[PDB]
Symmetry: D2
Subunit: 99 residues, 4 copies
């Protein structure tokens, strides 16, 4: 349940490449989304909400209007898990849908 260097070098890149970044003094990833509006931003959130419920993996996130900041870290390992990688991956399918 803990991203080992290997895992990381294989997994991180495709997200790193899109906007995801690792944080400091905490194993977790972040990314800032900026939609056109609230309709879209909430639409996006909802879709993410559904899946997080489905997987029992929740994001630390903040929104204001059309901006949505997401932060991913798994609780047990207290760092990244495969669980962050897919949610992100997922988040991504969803985002590019709106935008």
């Amino acid at each position: 349940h803990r991203l080992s260097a290997e895992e990381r070098d294989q997994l991180l890149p495709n997200l790193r490449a899109v906007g995801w970044n690792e944080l400091e003094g905490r194993d977790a990833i972040f990314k800032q989304f900026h939609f056109k509006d609230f309709n879209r931003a909430f639409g996006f959130m909802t879709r993410v909400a559904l899946q997080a419920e489905k997987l029992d993996h929740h994001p630390e996130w903040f929104n204001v209007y059309n901006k949505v900041h997401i932060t991913l870290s798994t609780h047990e390992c207290a760092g990244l898990s495969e669980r962050d990688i897919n949610l992100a991956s997922f988040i991504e399918q969803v985002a590019v849908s709106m935008t």
Copy 2:
């Protein structure tokens, strides 16, 4: 205001072009959307809810998993007003993001 004539024949066509049929035995239009899963289905529902609530024009919709059937008629008039029209397009636009 119970769309008149030339308008129905200005406006509707565009809607029929895209699959909007006229309802049988009611002044209404209806269309059904097929999504891949419920996740998209509901995400689509939400964007619309937000819009509906915002204009105070609420559809009649029936959902099952990944299928959403929507009916548009203005209550005030008991028929096709401009409200339906605009809602339908916003709907169309939203449809595309998921679809």
Copy 3:
């Protein structure tokens, strides 16, 4: 799976008491909910919708403004299964609060 009549007899009464009720041409439960406004109705849909995805069990449902008619049945067995009951239980909870 498809409930036996012994089962139907155990789980049903409580839902029956509450307003749930068997459909005539098929093996499913029906129940029409009414709320003050859309906010509440949509708000309620959203909570079952999360739950429904959590459990991979979806309802057939219809909504107009503040009214929501929910229909449950376990497709796989082609009739009431425990899923509909579980679900139904929860739908009940959510319901009671918005009222």
Copy 4:
């Protein structure tokens, strides 16, 4: 329309009473809600968003599972306003109905 000294006094009370605070640093009120789960949290977020959109007054909220932080300030007039108030009150009614 940035609330008056008289204004604040006649309004903040109740909110004040409920847990809502005024921010040092900015003309804004704040509150952190705590729920039993994400379902409720999210259901909550939803009705609110519904309203937020209705009004055209969006919140600054953060969410990490079962807790939500809300900050309200009227960008328009650089501080608290009738709006934030209103919306705030509403946030409350909705919160109550979450159990």
